[PDB]
Amino acid sequence: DLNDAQLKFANDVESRIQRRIEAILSPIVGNGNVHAQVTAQLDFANKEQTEEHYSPNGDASKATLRSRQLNISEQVGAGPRSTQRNETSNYEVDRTIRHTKMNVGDIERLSVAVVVNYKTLADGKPLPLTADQMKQIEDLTREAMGFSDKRGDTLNVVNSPFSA
Amino acid sequence: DLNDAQLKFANDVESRIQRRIEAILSPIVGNGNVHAQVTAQLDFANKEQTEEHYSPNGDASKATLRSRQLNISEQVGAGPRSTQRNETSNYEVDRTIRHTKMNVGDIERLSVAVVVNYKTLADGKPLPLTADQMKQIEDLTREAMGFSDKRGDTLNVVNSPFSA
Amino acid sequence: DLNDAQLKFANDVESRIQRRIEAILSPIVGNGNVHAQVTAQLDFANKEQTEEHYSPNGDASKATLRSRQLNISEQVGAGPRSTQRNETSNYEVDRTIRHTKMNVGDIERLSVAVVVNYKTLADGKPLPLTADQMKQIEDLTREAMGFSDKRGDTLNVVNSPFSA
Amino acid sequence: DLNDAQLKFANDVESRIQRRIEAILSPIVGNGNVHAQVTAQLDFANKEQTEEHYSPNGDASKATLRSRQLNISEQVGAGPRSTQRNETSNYEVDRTIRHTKMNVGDIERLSVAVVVNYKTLADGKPLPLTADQMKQIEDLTREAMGFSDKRGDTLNVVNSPFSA
Amino acid sequence: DLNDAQLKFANDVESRIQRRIEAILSPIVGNGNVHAQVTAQLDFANKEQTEEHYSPNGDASKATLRSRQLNISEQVGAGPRSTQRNETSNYEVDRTIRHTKMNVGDIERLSVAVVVNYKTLADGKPLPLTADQMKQIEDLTREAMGFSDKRGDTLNVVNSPFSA
């Protein structure tokens, strides 16, 4: 029931990422000379979070006060000195409440496998690509897939001649 | 259901960013001599936040007072001196409450992949572009995509001859 | 639903900024010899804010009083002196409450990409523009776009010959 | 909905400022020899403010009193002197409450771009204008646009020959 | 009843992972020259979790205070010294409540078995593959299956000639 809807959601996301990669990889490598497939680890767990933050007021310069009683006594007779300080302070503090409801269906970790073809010249020899072109393909695929390191995304692009 | 609506929202945003990039990249590079694709990491999490800020009043110059009782006693007989100061102060403080409801569907991180063609002169030789022109394309794409560093936007523009 | 309305709002704002830029850039550069595209980062977050400000009254010259009790005693017998001052003061303070509801749909950051053509004389040679003319175009575009530094606006105008 | 009404309001304000500038710039520069465009940053945020002001009464000359108790005692026996002064004062203070509801749709910052043509004499040579005439145009545009420094208004008028 | 639905859910997930692997393994190894099967250990246990986190306030620099009473007494007569410090502090602490409902049907551990064929040249000799090609197949399968180490995923790809 709901599981099938989630699976179809994942399939559509993967297909659209695949198409976005193919769109940029087509003009330079050529139609059919590139194949990519995407798998997506998604987030279907309902989470609700409330965050409370208090600004520190331990420093007297940023401390906000409402009432303060400072009783000071010094009975000098060091000799028979007698110092007494009774201090009472009531503070008002900065407060920030944030309520967050995470979206259901977010992407947790995306791994993408891309395979490119060789280059057959007018003679027909399948000449492999170069390192610079491979780096360009890797960068383009990283851009298309929305590659990020916080998610833990992995990308692998290899070059090999396609079968007949 | 709602996930499909969010996905269509993302697709429309990406398509419009793509079209905006293509619009400026067309007059100089030429029709079809430029291809770009956009992926968008969006924000579909409902967040509500209330912020409270208190202006500090620790300095006597900016401190606002309502009532103040200052009892001072000095019984000089340092000898048998006896100083006593009882101070009570009630303050009124500046207060700022901000209530914020973040919009659903905002952009978190935008990465854009752009590929340009080579230059075929009247002879037909695919002459590659220059560094200055590449920098101009990068700047134009950054302007079109709304490039920002707080979001974490990444842009990659590479030059390569298009396939037939 | 609402997201589409927000997107159409952004598109209309961007189109009108584009048209305003084109309107001034047309008479001097010429029809079609200028192309500009605008992207707008907008504010669709409902914010409500209440601000309270108290005027400081720590200086006796600007302090407003309602009731004041000053008991002073000096029993001179420094010898066996005995000074005692009990002071109680009730103040009235200036107060300013400001309630603000920010508009939904305001502009946060505007970045604009403008491209101009070269100058083809009667012979037909595409002569590039000059530095003074480029500075004039930059100033005119800044004026049209409502360029501001608090928002974080970025503008890029480059000169390049248009393709056929 | 409301955003479109606000945008149309901004467009009408900008168009009327443009027409006012054109009206004075026409008789001297000539019909069509002047083009101006206006952009307006407006205020669509509902603000409500209540201000309370108390006149200071720390000086005995401007202090208004309702009741005053002054107990003075001097038991001279400096010797065994004993001075005691108990003073209680109740004041009445001046008070001014101001309640302000700012208008929705006010102008925050106006920037205007104006371009003028060259002067083609009977021979047809496009003779540029002079510094005095440019200063006069700048002053007239500042007057028409309602130029102010508190708002942060910026004006740019440049001279360049119009294209065919 | 529900068990059959869960089993069909597992079968669909396994089939889609199998198809994703086959899709990338087809262009290089060839149609039919690759066979893969997937088994999935799934999560059909309903879990609900509430998390509470308190920011530490043991350091006086990050400690937020509401009321503080500090009575200090020093009766010097080390001699007959008498120090007494009574300190009472009330703190306000940061608080974060997270409520999480894990999705039913998540993947716990995925193990995948892939078998590839040999290479029969024009002569017909079944030449085995190379180490580099095997490593490429392993990497592609890891990318397709969403291989992760936290889950405990295991992958085994072996090379052997297919039977008639």
Residue numbers in the entry:
A (entry chain A), B (entry chain h), C (entry chain g), D (entry chain f), E (entry chain B): 229 to 305, 353 to 439
What does the original paper state about this entry?
The bacterial flagellar motor is a huge bidirectional rotary nanomachine that drives rotation of the flagellum for bacterial motility. The cytoplasmic C ring of the flagellar motor functions as the switch complex for the rotational direction switching from counterclockwise to clockwise. The basal body is made up of the LP ring, MS ring, C ring, rod and export apparatus. Here, we present two high-resolution cryo-electron microscopy structures of the C ring-containing flagellar basal body–hook complex from Salmonella Typhimurium, which are in the default counterclockwise state and in a constitutively active CheY mutant-induced clockwise state, respectively.
Given the high fragility of the C ring, we examined several reagents as the media of density gradient centrifugation in the purification of the intact C ring-containing basal body–hook complex in the default CCW state from our previously constructed ΔfliCD strain of S. Typhimurium, which lacks the flagellar filament, thus avoiding effects of the filaments on purification of the motor. The cryo-EM density map of the C ring-containing basal body–hook complex in the default CCW state was successfully determined to an overall resolution of 7.4 Å. Local refinements of the LP ring, MS ring, rod, hook and export apparatus generated their high-quality cryo-EM density maps at the resolutions ranging from 3.0 Å to 4.3 Å. Initial two-dimensional (2D) classification analyses of manually picked particles revealed that like the MS ring, the C ring adopts a 34-fold symmetric architecture. In the intact C ring-containing basal body–hook complexes, the MS ring is more stable and harbors much more clear densities for the outer RBM1 subring, outer RBM2 subring and putative inner RBM1 subring, which are made up of 11 RBM1, 11 RBM2 and 23 RBM1 domains of FliF, respectively. In the previously determined structure of the C ring-free basal body–hook complex, 5 L1 and 5 L2 loops, which consist of residues G311–P331 and residues P309–N324 of FliF, respectively, protrude from the β-collar region of the MS ring to bind the surface of the rod for torque transmission. In the intact C ring-containing basal body–hook complexes, there is one more peptide loop L3, which consists of the residues G310–P322 of FliF and is also extended from the β-collar region of the MS ring, bound in a hydrophobic groove that is formed by the α2–α3 linking loop of FliE6 with the D0 and DC domains of FlgC1 and FlgC6 on the surface of the rod. Thus, there are totally 11 FliF loops that extend from the MS ring to bind the rod in the basal body for torque transmission. These 11 loops are possibly derived from the FliF subunits in the 11-fold outer RBM1–RBM2 subrings. The more stable MS ring in the C ring-containing basal body–hook complexes indicates that the C ring is also important for the stability of the MS ring during motor assembly.
